[PDB]
């Protein structure tokens, strides 16, 4: 009601890359494609919220 408006003109996605050595970033790539090296995460709140 108070006349506040917002208008989103453009948007871009950015991504910072660590320049890892290609025979090291391929060993880490190969290690992280196992079923045993799955990157497992957990929500910090860890709660179902009603």
């Amino acid at each position: 009601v108070d006349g506040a408006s917002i208008k989103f003109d453009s948007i871009c996605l950015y991504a910072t890359f660590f320049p890892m050595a290609h025979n090291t970033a391929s060993t880490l790539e190969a290690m992280l494609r196992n079923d045993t090296n799955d990157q497992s995460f957990n929500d910090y709140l860890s709660a179902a919220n009603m």
Partner: peptide
């Protein structure tokens, strides 16, 4: 993997073994 570690002196400055995963939650 001592060629990836910085050298404090002539020994590789490695981390600890058991400091790999996270365990923090909302009070636990």
């Amino acid at each position: 993997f001592a060629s990836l570690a910085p050298r404090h002196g002539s020994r590789p400055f490695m981390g600890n073994w058991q400091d790999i995963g996270t365990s923090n939650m909302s009070g636990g």
